[PDB]
Design a protein around this ligand. Structure first.
Ligand SMILES: [Zn+2]
Ligand SMILES: [Zn+2]
Length: 56
């Protein structure tokens, strides 16, 4: 068919040079959400906000 709607490259944040706080697997699925909130998230050192908050 069309494989699926899994082209999460519309991420303005990555274009803006924003940080990413998710594992590759976690980014593949929730990339857009993995940049929210893009304010004062982790940064010490680096944690996956989805893996930090379980449900993964
Ligand atoms: Zn992104
Ligand atoms: Zn993760």
């Amino acid at each position: 068919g069309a494989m699926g709607m899994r082209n999460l490259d519309e991420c303005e944040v990555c274009r803006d040079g924003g940080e990413l706080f998710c594992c590759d697997t976690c980014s593949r699925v929730f990339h857009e959400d993995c940049h929210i909130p893009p304010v004062e998230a982790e940064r010490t050192p680096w944690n996956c906000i989805f893996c930090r908050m379980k449900e993964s």
